[PDB]
C-alpha cells in the first residue's frame, strides 16, 4: 500500500498527494482552456466528463481545503466556480442547455452552498457570492413551470422540455432540490426554504421512490405511467443525498420526524450500499465494465455526505465513522495501480487496482471518490457548516429573478 492514513498526519499527507493526482486531471486552469470543467464532454469526443462533473469536483476541493486546512488550490476552484454562473448566476450557462439536468443545476448550487457553510474565501465584490448562488438555483428550481401536476408534482430531471428525460421524474433531481432547502434553511434560518424541503420530501416518500417498508432509493419513474414505473435501480448517491437533506432538517427543526428518517435512511444505507465495511455501487460494481462515468463519483459524495451527517446529527457518529473509515482503508488499499504506483481505481471491495481503461475513462472519477474518503477521515476535527451566525458570504434577495433569466422566456 502506497498510501498511509493511520494517523492524522498520515491521513493529510495522502490526501495532498491525491489532491496533486486529481488535479492532473483538470486543464482548466491553463491557458486556452475553460476553468471548471473536466475534459469532456464525451459527445464532442474532447474527453470522458460532464460539466456536472465540475462541479462535483469543486465541491471536492471546496471540502478538501475546509477538512486540511490546504488552500493550495483555492484560487483555481474559485475560478471554475465562478466561470460556470451563467449570465444569470444560476448555474444556467446556455452553453450547457443539452446537460442542463435539474440536477446538473443542483450540483452546482450544492457546491456554492458548500464554500458558503465552509466559509470559502469569497469572490471578490462585483461577483455573485455563493450563498446567492446556492439562492439562485433553488429559486429557480422552485420556479413555478417546474412544477405541475404530472405525478401530483416532483421535479422532471431535464430543464428544457425539449431535452431528452423531460418525462423522467427521478430521485437526484428532487434530492438536489431538496437538499438545497434544507441546508438554505439551516444557513439563513429563513422557514421558507424549510416549507418546501418538506414537500419535496413527502413527494418522494408519497410516489414512492422511498421504499416505505425498507427505506431503499430508488432511481425515478416516467410522467406517463403517473410515475408508477418506478426503476428500482438503487443507486449510492440518491440515499445518501436524502441522508444528508434530512439531517439538516432534523438539525434546523429539531421535530423527531426527521430523526426517525435520518434513522431509517441511515439503516437502509448500510443494509444496501457497505459490504463488510466497504462502500460498493450496487447497480454496477459487480462487474466491471459496467458503471459510468457518472457512477464512478457516487461513492466520493457518499463519504462526504454521510460525515457531514454525523456532524449535524452527532447520535449518528458511531454508527458512520466506523464504516467510513473501513471503506477509506479499502479505498486506499487498491491505489497501487502503475505507472505511479498510487493510481486508484474504483473496485474498493475487490482489494484489487483495476485499472480504469476498464470502464472508458482517464479515471478522473475514482481520484476523486479516493480523495473525497480520505479527506473526510479528518471530519472529527472540522468544523460543522456554518450558518449566517459566523458566515462570510452574503445573500441576494433576487437571486434567480433576473428579468433576462431563463424562467422568463420558458
Ligand atoms: O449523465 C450525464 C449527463 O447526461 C446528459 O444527457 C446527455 C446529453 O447531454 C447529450 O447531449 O446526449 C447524451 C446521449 O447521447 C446524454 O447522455 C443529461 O442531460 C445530463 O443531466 C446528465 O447529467
Ligand atoms: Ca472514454
Same mark, same amino acid.
Given at each position: 500500500?502506497?498510501?498511509? $492514513?493511520? &494517523? ?28 471548471? $470543467? ?8 474532447? @474527453?470522458?466528463? +460532464? ?32 466561470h460556470q454562473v451563467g449570465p ?15 440536477? =446538473? ?44 401536476? &404530472?405525478?401530483? @408534482? ?59 417498508? &425498507?427505506?431503499?432509493? +430508488? ?33 434546523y427543526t429539531e421535530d423527531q420526524?426527521?430523526? =426517525? ?20 455501487? $450496487? ?17 466520493? +459524495? ?15 457518529? =458511531? ?25 486508484? @481505481?474504483?473496485?474498493?471491495?475487490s482489494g484489487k487496482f483495476v ?9 478522473? @472519477? ?14 472529527? +476535527?472540522?468544523?460543522?457548516?456554518? &450558518? ?23
Open positions: 500500500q502506497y498510501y498511509k $492514513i493511520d &494517523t492524522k498526519e498520515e491521513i493529510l499527507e495522502s490526501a495532498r498527494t491525491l489532491a496533486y493526482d486529481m488535479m492532473l486531471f483538470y486543464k482548466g486552469n491553463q491557458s486556452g482552456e475553460i476553468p471548471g $470543467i473536466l475534459p469532456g464532454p464525451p459527445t464532442e469526443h474532447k @474527453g470522458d466528463y +460532464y460539466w456536472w462533473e465540475g462541479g462535483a469536483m469543486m465541491g471536492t476541493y471546496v471540502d478538501y481545503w475546509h477538512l486540511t486546512g490546504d488552500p493550495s488550490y483555492n484560487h483555481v476552484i474559485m475560478e471554475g466556480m465562478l444569470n448566476a444560476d448555474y444556467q450557462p446556455p452553453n450547457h442547455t443539452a446537460s442542463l439536468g435539474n440536477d =446538473d443545476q443542483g450540483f452546482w448550487g450544492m457546491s456554492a452552498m458548500l464554500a458558503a457553510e465552509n466559509k470559502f474565501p469569497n469572490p471578490p465584490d462585483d461577483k455573485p457570492q455563493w450563498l446567492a448562488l446556492a439562492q439562485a438555483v433553488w429559486t429557480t428550481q422552485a420556479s413555478p413551470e417546474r412544477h405541475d401536476g &404530472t405525478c401530483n @408534482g416532483g421535479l422532471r430531471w431535464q430543464i428544457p422540455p425539449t431535452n431528452a428525460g423531460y418525462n423522467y421524474k427521478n430521485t437526484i433531481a428532487n434530492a438536489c432540490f431538496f437538499d438545497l432547502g434544507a441546508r438554505l434553511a439551516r444557513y439563513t434560518k429563513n422557514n421558507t426554504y424549510a416549507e418546501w424541503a418538506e414537500k419535496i420530501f413527502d413527494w418522494l416518500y408519497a410516489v414512492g421512490y422511498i421504499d416505505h417498508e &425498507t427505506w431503499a432509493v +430508488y432511481d425515478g419513474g416516467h410522467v406517463e405511467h403517473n410515475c408508477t414505473d418506478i426503476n428500482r435501480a438503487q443507486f449510492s448517491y440518491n440515499a445518501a443525498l436524502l441522508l444528508h437533506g434530512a439531517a439538516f432538517m432534523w438539525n420526524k426527521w430523526k =426517525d428518517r435520518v434513522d431509517n435512511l441511515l439503516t437502509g444505507i448500510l443494509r444496501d450500499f457497505f459490504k463488510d465495511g466497504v462502500v460498493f455501487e $450496487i447497480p454496477c460494481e459487480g462487474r466491471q465494465g459496467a458503471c459510468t462515468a457518472d457512477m464512478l463519483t457516487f461513492k466520493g +459524495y457518499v463519504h462526504r455526505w454521510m460525515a457531514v451527517v454525523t456532524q449535524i446529527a452527532p447520535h449518528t457518529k =458511531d454508527r458512520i465513522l466506523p464504516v467510513l473509515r473501513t471503506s477509506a482503508e479499502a479505498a486506499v488499499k487498491q491505489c497501487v495501480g502503475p505507472p505511479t504506483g498510487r493510481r486508484c @481505481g474504483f473496485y474498493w471491495k485499472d480504469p481503461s476498464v470502464d472508458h475513462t482517464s479515471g478522473a @472519477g475514482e481520484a476523486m471518490s479516493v480523495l473525497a474518503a480520505v479527506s473526510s477521515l479528518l471530519i472529527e +476535527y472540522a468544523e460543522p457548516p456554518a &450558518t449566517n451566525e459566523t458566515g462570510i458570504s452574503r445573500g441576494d434577495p433576487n437571486a434567480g429573478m433576473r428579468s433576462r433569466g431563463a424562467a422568463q422566456h420558458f
